[PDB]
Amino acid sequence: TGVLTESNKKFLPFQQFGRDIADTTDAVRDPQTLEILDITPCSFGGVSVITPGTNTSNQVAVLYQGVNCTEVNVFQTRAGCLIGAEYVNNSYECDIPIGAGICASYQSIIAYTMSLGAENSVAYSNNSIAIPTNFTISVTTEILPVSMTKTSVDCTMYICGD
């Protein structure tokens, strides 16, 4: 199953089958008409369903990974073609990661370029320093896993039972 196209591969007279690097049949020759037809697999790609919780909404958007928009609210990304989300110039934090700097959120589903953070130009000079005049005692949490569930498997009883 594939698309047959014209080829510019100079096949030798004995040769019939054409093989790519992976031994996939790149091209084929026909007995009835002695011409070389390049074989290319038909268009395909991965579908990713971008969705918020079902608690909030039932709207979904689809991302066709690595597929340009002309071979399938249409937005072209480096990750692929995004259908169902409207690109917004406004930058926000990443809610649902799409890829290549693009993230999605629900507000309808919007797609935007993720914001790295707020700009803060420090007023550097050659003779000025900033000295703290107060302090905040901050307590923060750090959660670290230590152990796992201890599992034992009876190999004979699992595979064979009784």
Binding site: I129, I131, P132, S138, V139, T140, E142, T149, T151, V153
Partner: protein
């Protein structure tokens, strides 16, 4: 907040669940139940069907054990990190930046959690900063004075010496400054008096 520990529990349960689901796979045999194969097939063909079930179930169990070993390695690395935090944040004060919380670390408190530890990092965060005019050294009597433990600051008309992490202006004296050289070498030295006790 506590998703990481929950993820560990979830992964373990999911792996066990998948392994039980693997018992309901025929693996290319007539049935997934050994009793059905024993009751419906004579031993010549029964050995082949049980062989198919044995190889598929053994492959599933090997896959599960391999996943468990990789996850055990990850949890061992996390536990070694947690022990390092327990030794260096709780049992001492750490000068390592961001190891024991955001900010200058003061102390830490351990709390037990299911399959894990939660560290309450008590840190000192500077706040309410103010601009001051600064100089590297003070020129007095043809000598350059440098701060012993602080920094020279100016509020506009007067010069003081203060500690770097809190604003506590003190008069520039010979007790909090040291003399090294004349005033001709330091770039940016300003002229100000240095008091003598």
């Amino acid at each position: 907040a506590l998703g990481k520990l929950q993820d560990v529990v979830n992964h373990n349960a999911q792996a066990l669940n998948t392994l039980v689901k693997q018992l309901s796979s025929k693996f290319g045999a007539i049935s997934s139940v050994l009793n059905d194969i024993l009751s419906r097939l004579d031993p010549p063909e029964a050995e082949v069907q049980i062989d198919r079930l044995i190889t598929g179930r053994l492959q599933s169990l090997q896959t599960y054990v391999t996943q468990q070993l990789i996850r055990a390695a990850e949890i061992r690395a996390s536990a070694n990190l947690a022990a390092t935090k327990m030794s260096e944040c709780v049992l001492g004060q750490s000068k390592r930046v961001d190891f024991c919380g955001k900010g200058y670390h003061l102390m830490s408190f351990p709390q037990s959690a299911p399959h894990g530890v939660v560290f309450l990092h008590v840190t000192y965060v500077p706040a309410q900063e103010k601009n001051f005019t600064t100089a590297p050294a003070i020129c007095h009597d043809g000598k350059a004075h440098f701060p012993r433990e602080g920094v020279f600051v100016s509020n506009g008309t007067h010069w003081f010496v203060t500690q770097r992490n809190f604003y506590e202006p003190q008069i520039i004296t010979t007790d909090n400054t040291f003399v090294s050289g004349n005033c001709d070498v330091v770039i940016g030295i300003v002229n100000n008096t240095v008091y003598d006790p």
